[PDB]
């Protein structure tokens, strides 16, 4: 429930959260394709600005090493679609979350991008809250009976929920076990054209962020000014392959 009426200059709060759990791995002789919603080419219909909702366009692109996976807010370009730099956490608010375009990579003729794929996504709604700022598209009059003496101002009706990856377990692991490409979904049955192989991996089950604390001084009592806190994360991989020689 809550809360009455405190819309003001800045209502931003320091909030932390855990993301949706996602495991996936793909293999192909061509880089994978990801899809995301971005500020679309202007414009469908015409003609005027400003501050209106930007047009949306589903952009298919190549997934590069370092691109962000979806979190709990979709695959979109937060740098363009959220101009306040404050609607999502700092690690995604200035980049783009890309989601794999399984449909397109499976429907391509040769199928050079999907030798195979494995995936496991899971999340639930942790908490709910509303956005501060002006409602660009207000609730129609037919759907709300206006009040109220007091109240009278329709509350912010822009709802978003924090995600949560729930439980991570060893039984849910996709890795540390071999996969044998018995049969490929596409026509390319595991042939590494160009003598190269693209292996895409997303693993959020080992996302633990280590906290480091270095002392600048050591006062007689405990003082927060004596310490600096740092964030550090690590990733350990071991790629093992077994190839078969073929002649043409």
């Amino acid at each position: 429930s809550g809360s009455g009426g405190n819309p003001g200059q800045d209502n931003r709060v320091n909030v932390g959260m855990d993301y949706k759990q996602t495991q996936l791995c793909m293999v192909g002789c061509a880089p994978p394709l990801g899809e995301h919603w971005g500020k679309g080419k202007q414009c469908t219909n015409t003609p005027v600005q400003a501050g209106d909702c930007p047009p949306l366009e589903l952009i298919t692109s190549v997934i590069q090493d370092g691109d962000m996976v979806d979190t709990g807010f979709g695959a979109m370009n937060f740098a363009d679609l959220q101009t306040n730099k404050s609607d999502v956490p700092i690690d995604i608010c200035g980049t783009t979350c890309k989601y794999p375009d399984y449909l397109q990579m499976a429907a391509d003729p040769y199928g050079d991008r999907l030798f195979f794929f494995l995936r496991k996504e899971q999340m639930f709604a942790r908490h709910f809250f509303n956005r501060a700022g002006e409602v660009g598209e207000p609730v129609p009059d037919t759907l709300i009976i206006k009040g109220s003496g007091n109240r009278t101002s329709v509350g912010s009706s822009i709802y978003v929920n924090t995600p949560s990856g729930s439980l991570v377990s060893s039984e849910a692991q996709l890795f540390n076990k071999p996969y044998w490409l018995q049969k490929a979904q596409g026509h390319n049955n595991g042939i590494c054209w160009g003598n190269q192989l693209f292996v895409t991996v997303v693993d959020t089950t080992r996302s633990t962020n280590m906290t480091l604390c270095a002392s600048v001084t050591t006062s007689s009592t405990y003082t927060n000014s004596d310490y600096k806190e740092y964030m550090r994360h690590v990733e350990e991989y071991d790629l093992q392959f077994i190839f078969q020689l073929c002649s043409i």
Partner: antibody
Amino acid sequence: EVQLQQSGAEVVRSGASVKLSCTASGFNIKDYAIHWVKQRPEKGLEWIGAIDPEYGDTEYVPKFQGKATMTADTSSNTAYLQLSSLTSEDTAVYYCNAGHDYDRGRFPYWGQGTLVTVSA
Amino acid sequence: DIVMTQSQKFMSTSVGDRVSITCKASQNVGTAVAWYQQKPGQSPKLMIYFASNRYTGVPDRFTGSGSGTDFTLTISNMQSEDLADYFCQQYSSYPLTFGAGTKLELKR
């Protein structure tokens, strides 16, 4: 390109009603919070009320309740302010103000001003 | 009814100087205070809103400050175009109220 045009000055005898109009504030889906301000050469500025197009919500001042009536036409248009029994204390310049999209405090977009003279 | 009390009705200064107009609230209004400029024969123009935020338009010459019950508008170095009335407004609770007029005149 965001200016507000009003009805125009009017000379009214005492005991008759007058209706003031505004323009280009109050559209479908947008959204504005329209306010009206009275300017008496002695009392400075006095806030009248706040009306919201797309909802037609209405808030008034206890001083002006029963004196000022507010209406909003969702198509076009908006915002009509009418005063009933006009007396000598109503001779003032009335403004139609709209803070951009919403809120109270902000009047960055003022009307041209309408001078009402209630006298014989 | 929150009463907006401005110190002086008229204010003297000269070109280039620094002027500070005070606005005292009868209640705590946080930072829900706005300032306006009105020239003779014209409609008021918004200058500062939310105590210390300049509106699109207004030069860095104008600076707002204060919180709670004491608010101040400061004009760091003046121009002839700044001669007008200046009002402060409260929007913490209904009804909305304004302060008395304040005329700025030059000592040229």
